[PDB]
Amino acid sequence: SGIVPQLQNIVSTVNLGCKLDLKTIALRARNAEYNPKRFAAVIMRIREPRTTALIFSSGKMVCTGAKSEEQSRLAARKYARVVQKLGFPAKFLDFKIQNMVGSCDVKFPIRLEGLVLTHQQFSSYEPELFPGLIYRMIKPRIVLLIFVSGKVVLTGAKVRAEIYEAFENIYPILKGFRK
Amino acid sequence: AQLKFFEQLDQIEKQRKDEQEREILMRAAQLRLKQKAKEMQQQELAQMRQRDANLTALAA
Amino acid sequence: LDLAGPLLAFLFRGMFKNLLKEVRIYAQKFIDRGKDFNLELAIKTRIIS
Amino acid sequence: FIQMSVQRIVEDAPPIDLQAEAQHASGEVEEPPRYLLKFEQIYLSKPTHWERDGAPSPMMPNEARLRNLTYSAPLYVDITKTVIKEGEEQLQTQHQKT
Amino acid sequence: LSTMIGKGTGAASFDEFGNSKYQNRRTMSSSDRAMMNAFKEITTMADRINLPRNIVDRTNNLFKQVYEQKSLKGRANDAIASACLYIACRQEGVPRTFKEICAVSRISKKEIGRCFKLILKALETSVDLITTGDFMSRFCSNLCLPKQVQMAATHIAR
Amino acid sequence: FGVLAKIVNYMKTRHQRGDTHPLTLDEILDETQHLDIGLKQKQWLMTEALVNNPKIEVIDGKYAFKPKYNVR
Amino acid sequence: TVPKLYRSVIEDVINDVRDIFLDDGVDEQVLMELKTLWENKLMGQVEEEPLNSEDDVSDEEGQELFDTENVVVCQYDKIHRSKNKWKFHLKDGIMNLNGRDYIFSKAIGDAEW
Amino acid sequence: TNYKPVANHQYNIEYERKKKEDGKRARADKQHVLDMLFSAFEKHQYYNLKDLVDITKQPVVYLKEILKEIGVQNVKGIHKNTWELKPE
Amino acid sequence: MAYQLYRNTTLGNSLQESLDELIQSQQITPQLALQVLLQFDKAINAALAQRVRNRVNFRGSLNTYRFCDNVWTFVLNDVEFREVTELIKVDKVKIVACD
């Protein structure tokens, strides 16, 4: 096809294996915030990987905003090391990538009406709710947001291979509806 | 100090007069009892209000 | 002799009382919750018709 | 009936008075708001039939006979709603032709 | 398979302090009472915008299928009923906008849309895409525009 | 008076320690981070009212043996 | 201007503490002495458990320890952030910039992270 | 004009704004919650769980756990079985 | 037992030092000093809330931020406090906010 999606956000969950004090972490950390009335976790941000992590008292942490798998793992390790520097026995256990988000452009307008007519079993086009067509691919469990401008956003992937395969599957279909 | 004890006895007479000189105004329309009840209500607020002070001092 | 007018007036009296009763109930629920109930939703149009 | 009795029945009905049941368990010095509704000025439209599309259209009597429709006319009432929250301000919003 | 009792006559029906009908009748189960309340809400919402009875019956059938399927048991009843009404209007070929359905339902547009998506998934069905010509008749009639103006607007949009 | 019920809970955890010994009010008030002033006197009036109904036993001398049934 | 506000604050503070000085039974000369002194004083790692593989992943923490630089203490009504920038509706408060004090009612701020 | 299409009813948006601004009640430390509970009981002897939740401003589950630790439910002729804040 | 914001400022520091001097002289008891601080906090909060009617602006960059117990602890760099009457430049600032 000549086009490869580029990742825009990666979500990864890792367990530190130890209970934590959210108030202490908020008081002692650099960029952390803790609003128990609003959310039950602690939100921290690191600029060099340009990511944000949520840390819970159960010891499980979720890292988002990373553009690459390596960046996600490094950012999660950095957050764990920051928590460890705060005196806690933080570890790096069962790190896993829960979700990946990729974006790309097909460089031509798309007739979403014909697309939903042809693939009604997988398509959902409701301009009242959202201008972008939602396509639920089955062989890879990927949800694609297709827009009339040609931009395609893929989400729900665990590995980059799923993103690339889903785009490879969807590209001939979209080429069939080029405006 | 003996004079201060006498002044405290005078303040006790003044509180009795104030409480009774109008336990009568309420009747014309228990004042001490009402005051005590009011004092009881603040206790809960005071502490909910107060321990915030302890955490804010730790925070700042 | 009770003609069409008085008979329908009796029926409409009853049904408008019922309509106001339903508005009272429906608005009282929302008032207890502290939401500012919409009058148009309170009116049950089917009652009179 | 239509010209006088319907309007008189609307006006004779007592205004609806509603207030909360000591909501929030606060000082509650008449704190629950008072909602007052008064119906007024009943209006009747010409007989109208609304299609499956929802588009209003006049309903001729013969069409009612043929299609088994009911020959009826919409009934509209002006309603005035006043909110008294003991905030020293009362707001009287008016709903026209409900 | 039930009955009910009334006052009857004036004698031993009311007892020591007006016992009434010995009781209050107290009939049915929730798996039917919730559906009954939803049916009443559906009829009210439809009458608010003068929907025909066939659309009401289609909405009732859709709600029965969704309610028994139970993938939306966590969603509040009125949202399910509103989404079912929207879907029935779409299937009958006379779509109402999400805002139009929200105007007659206490449920917000966002929740109605979410329950609409969920009901579509649960029923494994689909609704034809709305076109500009679907809303022309209702919009023009509510605006009291002439027939020629309505035709011109429909043609321009198409 | 609420602080008094809290003292009752404190002596309940003291029973839970099993090191229950004849005590008094001052040491408990100190260990529970509370002072000894006329406030202690009014709360001790309340505490003697408690001694009139201390199902959780609070006697004046050698005391605090709450459990109506207690062997180990 | 700011000194005049300070004098008004002095008046408010003394008036507010008079009742406490009567409640505690202390003589009123304490307030005069307090005001005098106050004015005078003012004017491939498969085994990933070890986190030591990375170092110097932090910054100097002595800024918060020092606090010697300029400090602003106020109250916040709304604080919004959209992925890059921090926005500040800080209401009435005080600022200590270069020793000189500043007083404000509405403070609007935009910053980048 | 009746039943005009609106994205969301005005009263609902006002209520949602109020709820969002207030936020969910936070789970405070056991010591402070216990002290507040004891003061509340000092007001007078009998409390219902709903108004006690209002007074304490704590999650219902957490407050129920703390109250089950010390307080006991008594079935009474007042209206119903309610909590008793006296530990014994 | 109050908001306790302005204690760590020039005004609060001067008041605290004066109270320390009187405590050293035995003229006032520490409970009285604490009561004076509480009353000062109330009075200063009221005074700033009421007698201040000026609007200020500022811009810059943020280097750190913290939040806990409804207490923001922002740390900005190269801030420019702009006002219609005057403009002030500062290399670094720490903004502590509460509500």
Interface of I with G in 7-66 (CB under 8 A): 8-11, 14-15, 17-19, 21-22, 27-29, 31-32, 35-36, 39-40, 42-44, 46-49, 51-65
Rounded-to-integer distance, Cα G77 and Cα I18, Å: 33
Quick one: closest CA in H to C40, which residue?
Answer: H3
Binding site annotation covers E121?
A: no
Asked if A84's CB is within 8 angstroms of G51's CB, the reply is yes
Residues of A in contact with H27 (CB under 8 A): 36
> Are A109 and A135 a contacting pair, CB within 8 Å?
no
Smallest Cα–Cα separation from A173: which of A131, A144, A130? A144
Residues of C in contact with E43 (CB under 8 A): 46
Rounded-to-integer distance, Cα I39 and Cα G47, Å: 59
Residues of B in contact with H57 (CB under 8 A): 48
Rounded-to-integer distance, Cα I16 and Cα I28, Å: 13
Structural method: cryo-EM
Rounded-to-integer distance, Cα A77 and Cα A71, Å: 10
> Are A8 and A101 a contacting pair, CB within 8 Å?
yes
Do A68 and A18 share a structural domain? yes
Q: What's the domain count of chain H?
A: 1
Rounded-to-integer distance, Cα G113 and Cα A44, Å: 13
How far does the CA of residue I77 sit from the closest CA of chain A (Å)? Answer: 15
Q: What's the domain count of chain A?
A: 2
DSSP 8-class letter at H2: T
Q: Are strands A130-136 and A51-55 parallel, antiparallel or unpaired?
A: unpaired
Domain end call among A97, A122, A137: A97
What range defines the domain where residue G27 resides?
Answer: 1-43
Rounded-to-integer distance, Cα B32 and Cα B34, Å: 5
Asked if H40's CB is within 8 angstroms of B51's CB, the reply is no
Sequence-distant (6+) residues with CB within 8 A of I11 are: G6, G9, G42, I44
Which resolution, in Å, applies to this structure? 5.8
Binding site annotation covers E96?
A: no
Rounded-to-integer distance, Cα E78 and Cα E69, Å: 16
Which CATH number applies to I1-53? 1.10.287.190
Q: Are strands G85-96 and G70-82 parallel, antiparallel or unpaired?
A: antiparallel
Q: C24 and chain D: CB distance < 8 Å anywhere?
A: yes
Asked if D98's CB is within 8 angstroms of C43's CB, the reply is yes
Would residue E63 be called left, alpha or beta, if left means φ above 0 and alpha means ψ between -120 and 50 degrees?
Answer: alpha
Asked if H27's CB is within 8 angstroms of A37's CB, the reply is no
Q: What is the 3-state secondary structure (H, E, C) of chain F?
A: CHHHHHHHHHHHHHHHHCCCCCCCHHHHHHHCCCCCCHHHHHHHHHHHHHHHCCCCCCCCCCCCCCCCCCCC
Smallest Cα–Cα separation from D19: which of I60, C28, A158? C28
User: Beta partners for D34?
Assistant: D19, D84
Asked if I11's CB is within 8 angstroms of G6's CB, the reply is yes
> A135 is written with which tokens?
């396509």
The number of angstroms, rounded, from the C-alpha of F6 to the middle of its chain's C-alpha atoms is 9
Q: Are strands H72-74 and G106-112 parallel, antiparallel or unpaired?
A: unpaired
Report the CATH number at residue A107: 3.30.310.10
- SS3 assignment, position E90: helix
Interface of G with I in 51-70 (CB under 8 A): 63-64, 67, 69-70
Rounded-to-integer distance, Cα I9 and Cα I40, Å: 13
- Touching chains, I (3+ CB pairs < 8 A): A, B, G
Rounded-to-integer distance, Cα A44 and Cα A63, Å: 9
Do A121 and A60 share a structural domain? no
User: Beta partners for A60?
Assistant: A15
Rounded-to-integer distance, Cα G108 and Cα H5, Å: 37
Residues of E in contact with A121 (CB under 8 A): 126
Rounded-to-integer distance, Cα I19 and Cα I10, Å: 14
Instruction: Closest CB to H54: pick one of D25, D76, D96.
Output: D25
Q: What is the 3-state secondary structure (H, E, C) of H62-82?
A: HHHHHHHHHCEEECCCCCCCE
Asked if C38's CB is within 8 angstroms of H15's CB, the reply is no
**E-assigned strands of D1-97?**
16-19, 34-44, 48-50, 56-58, 75-84, 90-95
Sign of CA dihedral F15, F19, F22, F24: negative
Best CATH choice for the domain E29-126 from the list 3.60.10.10, 1.10.510.10, 1.10.472.10, 3.40.30.10: 1.10.472.10
Residues of H in contact with D24 (CB under 8 A): 54
Has residue H78 been placed in a domain?
A: yes
Torsion of CA E45, E47, E49, E52, to 10 degrees: 110
Residue-by-residue DSSP string for A83-122? HHHTT-----EEEEEEEEEEEEE-SS-B-HHHHHHHTTTT
Strand ranges of the sheet holding H72-74, from the earlier edge strand across to the other edge:
H46-47, H82-84, H72-74
Q: Which fold has domain I54-99?
A: TATA box binding Protein, subunit D; domain 2 (2.30.18)
> Are H36 and B48 a contacting pair, CB within 8 Å?
yes
- Touching chains, A (3+ CB pairs < 8 A): E, G, H, I
**A15, A43, A52, A92: which to substitute to probe chain G, counting the most G Cβ within 10 Å?**
A92
> Are G30 and I22 a contacting pair, CB within 8 Å?
yes
Report the CATH number at residue H54: 1.10.10.10
Q: C38 and chain H: CB distance < 8 Å anywhere?
A: yes
Write out the binding residues of A for DNA: 9, 45, 60, 99, 136
Residue-by-residue DSSP string for C1-49? ---HHHHHHHHHHHHHHHHHHHHHHHHHHHHHHT----HHHH--TTTT-
What range defines the domain where residue A1 resides?
Answer: 1-11+98-179
Rounded-to-integer distance, Cα I22 and Cα G78, Å: 41
Binding site annotation covers E147?
A: no
Ranges of each domain in chain I: 1-53, 54-99
> Are A23 and I70 a contacting pair, CB within 8 Å?
no
Rounded-to-integer distance, Cα A54 and Cα A60, Å: 9
Count of H helices and E strands in chain I? Answer: 2, 3
Rounded-to-integer distance, Cα B56 and Cα I69, Å: 7
Smallest Cα–Cα separation from A127: which of E140, E98, E124? E98
Do A3 and A21 share a structural domain? no
User: Beta partners for A6?
Assistant: A103
Q: D53 and chain E: CB distance < 8 Å anywhere?
A: yes
Report the CATH number at residue G38: 1.10.287.100
From residue I96, how far is each of A4, G72, G109 by CA, in Å?
47, 6, 13
> Are I88 and I57 a contacting pair, CB within 8 Å?
no
Has residue H48 been placed in a domain?
A: yes
Q: Using alpha carbons only, how large is chain E's radius of gyration in Å?
A: 22
E22 phi/psi in degrees, rounded to 5: 70, -15
> C48 is written with which tokens?
């009179």
